[PDB]
Symmetry: C7
Subunit: 29 residues, 7 copies
């Protein structure tokens, strides 16, 4: 479904935020 697939895109984008926060943690290291 198009609504389901759009929500799936939101989920993938949140994963990008998680990765970026891991990069922040790395910078502090």
């Amino acid at each position: 479904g198009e609504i389901a697939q759009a929500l799936k895109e939101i989920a993938k984008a949140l994963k990008e935020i998680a990765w970026a926060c891991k990069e922040i943690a790395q910078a502090l290291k």
Copy 2:
């Protein structure tokens, strides 16, 4: 349902963000 399952995927992704922020906290503690 596919909408419900996609919403759960959002929830799972959000937990990944929480864990990453905990890594930020740890990085600041070390």
Copy 3:
């Protein structure tokens, strides 16, 4: 309902993000 329950799972995860941000604050103190 399954949608409502999934939305509640999202609220719970957002609380986990809040708690993690509190740990960042504590780490800075």
Copy 4:
């Protein structure tokens, strides 16, 4: 409605994240 109430729970959780971020700013101020 249960969907509306669940969305309100999401709004309240986001407010907790906002408050935590204010705690971070406070921590940086001392």
Copy 5:
């Protein structure tokens, strides 16, 4: 509608997060 108004509350809560993040930025300049 109750669902639309709940979504609007989520938007308002996200703005609260943006403001808290601006406070973080202010704290770091100071």
Copy 6:
């Protein structure tokens, strides 16, 4: 639609968070 427009407001608020995070980046670079 009323629900669609509320979702657009959520998107706009998320963009505000993105800008606040860029402000954090600016403060650290300063």
Copy 7:
């Protein structure tokens, strides 16, 4: 659909936050 496209904007806005957070990470490296 208008709701689906609205959700897609939300996805794009979340990506902007991710990029902004990477700017924070880069700022910490500098």
